[PDB]
Amino acid sequence: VNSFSGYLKLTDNVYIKNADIVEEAKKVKPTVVVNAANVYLKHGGGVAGALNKATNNAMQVESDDYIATNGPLKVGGSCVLSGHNLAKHCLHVVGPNVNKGEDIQLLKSAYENFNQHEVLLAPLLSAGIFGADPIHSLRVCVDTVRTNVYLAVFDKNLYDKLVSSFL
Ligand SMILES: O[C@H]1CCC[C@@H]1Nc1ncnc2[nH]ccc12
Ligand SMILES: [Cl-]
């Protein structure tokens, strides 16, 4: 039993809700919140900009030190950093950005990072301003993640579309 509330159950391990991931994180304080990161951990917009804003830019400060030490992530890769005031940990995961020409096949690799954590609050990778089809992202999530994932979908219209079209 966990404290996630109001989710629709899609499969044995995947749950979905129309919610602002920032407000959800502040309520649940999950062990792991997933960020929709880029390889530079430059948290400018979308989920990343919103999460970082909610940390008062502490996420960005921590991320800049991470990059200065380690260099950029790989597309499809991840790193674990602090969750600041939102969660114990933030798993920064880089899905391919279609608006940069990146290989959509890398979306499965991106979701594989979730399997290193027993429970996660997460967005749909590569959706939104990353330019992929969210229906496809949900399908890859369900077919790749085996741990317990609670998906927050900001856009109510998209949420309803994702539920109604889910196979
Ligand atoms: O699932 C994500 C992945 C792409 C579209 C969805 N959008 C959001 N859902 C919830 N909170 C959010 N805060 C900022 C953006 C956002
Ligand atoms: Cl977005």
Swiss-Prot record:
Domain Macro as annotated: residue spans: 1-167
How would you describe this protein's topology in the membrane?
A: Multi-pass membrane protein
Entry superkingdom: Viruses
Location of this chain's protein in the cell: Host endoplasmic reticulum membrane
Task: Kindly state which reaction or reactions the protein catalyses.
Answer: Thiol-dependent hydrolysis of ester, thioester, amide, peptide and isopeptide bonds formed by the C-terminal Gly of ubiquitin (a 76-residue protein attached to proteins as an intracellular targeting signal)
Q: Which residues form a coiled coil?
A: none
State the activity regulation.
Answer: Inhibited in vitro by GRL-0617.
Q: How does it assemble?
A: May form homohexamers. Interacts with N protein.
Tell me, in a sentence or two, what this protein's role is.
Responsible for the cleavages located at the N-terminus of the replicase polyprotein. Participates together with nsp4 in the assembly of virally-induced cytoplasmic double-membrane vesicles necessary for viral replication. Antagonizes innate immune induction of type I interferon by blocking the phosphorylation, dimerization and subsequent nuclear translocation of host IRF3. Also prevents host NF-kappa-B signaling. In addition, PL-PRO possesses a deubiquitinating/deISGylating activity and processes both 'Lys-48'- and 'Lys-63'-linked polyubiquitin chains from cellular substrates.
According to UniProt, the name of this protein is Papain-like protease nsp3
Name of the encoding gene: rep
Instruction: Please indicate which part of the intact protein appears here, giving the first and last residue numbers and the full length.
Output: 1025 to 1191 of 7096
